[PDB]
Amino acid sequence: QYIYPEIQRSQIFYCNHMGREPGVFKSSFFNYYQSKNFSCQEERDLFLEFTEKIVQNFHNINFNYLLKKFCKLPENYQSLKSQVKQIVKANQQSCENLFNSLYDTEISYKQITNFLRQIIQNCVPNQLLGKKNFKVFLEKLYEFVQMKRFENQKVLDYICFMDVFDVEWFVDLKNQKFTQKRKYISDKRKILGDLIVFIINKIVIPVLRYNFYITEKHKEGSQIFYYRKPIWKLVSKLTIVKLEE
RNA sequence: AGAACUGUC
RNA sequence: UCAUUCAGUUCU
Ligand SMILES: [Mg+2]
């Protein structure tokens, strides 16, 4: 047995921080790590070459446009921003209608997934996971978004639909590939899992966390909703004026 | 009031 | 650039 690294999906929830311009954090490797299951020292350099290849294309990604295209602020946002710019010893009902408009602005699972897929396809090279495996990875992203609170994914359900032979940059020490490949699959699946974790944990999740406030409603059960960071800043700021209530 | 830059869960 | 909270600086 091999226990794959955990996908941390609890990170996407309840992030209040707005960072001005989009494109994740300053703490992320994207702005200014772990090698284990790799064979020899050569694979580690090949992985490091993809990572620096990855961060460069990331800066070429325009998050302002990709958001606009996919996950879009409401057309009344300016009016919503204006109405919260008011109220700051009255305001009782009108705020209730103002909260109903802000929470109305949730972003659909398909929207979020199309956004994520667009980020990954631009950010992550197709040669990293291999052509067919990269396609399997992108398809599985909708389930990741759609899934409720406390619902998670396992790397086990990723790799099992993939092929380790689709990865061309994996290296073969002293040729075990065609001799015993039950072993080769066993060793390389450990690396492929680390790559899947890498994309999801260090890219997909921090993108979602940073740009969106993800939570669940009391009335909606464990089902989760994606709110735009600016929208939630309005909500958060409209809750603060309720300090009196 | 318009505009520009920078740090950042 | 649909947006740009918080903090800090600057040009009319
Ligand atoms: Mg200021």
* A4: amino acid identity, one letter: Y
Q: Identify whether residues A49 and A167 lie together within a single domain.
A: yes
Q: Identify whether residues A39 and A117 lie together within a single domain.
A: yes
Nucleic strand B near CB of residue A96 (< 7 Å): no
Q: Identify whether residues A116 and A191 lie together within a single domain.
A: yes
Query: CA separation (Å) from A209 to A110, A142, A226?
Result: 17, 16, 10
Q: Identify whether residues A115 and A23 lie together within a single domain.
A: yes
Nucleic strand C near CB of residue A69 (< 7 Å): no
Header resolution in angstroms: 3.0
Contacts 24+ apart (CB under 8 A), A226-229: A226/A71, A226/A106, A226/A107, A226/A108, A226/A109, A226/A111, A226/A112, A226/A145, A227/A103, A227/A105, A227/A106, A227/A107, A228/A67, A228/A71, A228/A73, A228/A105, A228/A107, A229/A17, A229/A18
Domain that holds residue A55: 1-72+106-228
Report the domain count for chain A: 2
Q: Identify whether residues A136 and A219 lie together within a single domain.
A: yes
Q: How far apart are alpha carbons A82 and A101 in whole angstroms?
A: 13
Under DSSP, is residue A207 helix (H, G, I), strand (E, B) or coil? helix
Q: Identify whether residues A204 and A160 lie together within a single domain.
A: yes
Number of other residues whose CB lies within 10 A of the CB of residue A128 = 21
Q: What are the structure tokens assigned to A108, written together?
A: 């659909």
CA of A19 to the centre of ligand 1 (A): 14
Q: Identify whether residues A39 and A154 lie together within a single domain.
A: yes
Q: What are the structure tokens assigned to A190, written together?
A: 């450990």
Q: What are the structure tokens assigned to A105, written together?
A: 């602005």
Nucleic strand B near CB of residue A63 (< 7 Å): no
Nucleic strand C near CB of residue A67 (< 7 Å): yes
Which nucleotide's C1' sits nearest to the alpha carbon of A31?
B8
Q: Identify whether residues A221 and A237 lie together within a single domain.
A: no
Q: How far apart are alpha carbons A233 and A213 in whole angstroms?
A: 9
Q: Identify whether residues A116 and A158 lie together within a single domain.
A: yes
Q: How many CA atoms lie within 13 A of A193 on its CB side?
A: 21
Q: What are the structure tokens assigned to A57, written together?
A: 């294309």
* A196: amino acid identity, one letter: I
Q: Identify whether residues A90 and A188 lie together within a single domain.
A: no
Q: How far apart are alpha carbons A91 and A14 in whole angstroms?
A: 27
Q: How far apart are alpha carbons A47 and A52 in whole angstroms?
A: 9
Q: How far apart are alpha carbons A167 and A196 in whole angstroms?
A: 13
Q: Which of chain B's bases lie under 7 Å from a protein CB?
A: 6-9
For residues A196 and A137, the answer to whether their CB atoms sit within 8 Å is: yes
CA of A18 to the centre of ligand 1 (A): 14
Solved with: X-ray
Q: Identify whether residues A14 and A51 lie together within a single domain.
A: yes
Residue A201, judged by CB atoms within 10 A of its CB (0-12, 13-18, 19+), counts as middle
CATH number of residue A189's parent domain: 1.10.132.70
For residues A216 and A223, the answer to whether their CB atoms sit within 8 Å is: yes
Q: Identify whether residues A123 and A171 lie together within a single domain.
A: yes
For residues A181 and A189, the answer to whether their CB atoms sit within 8 Å is: no
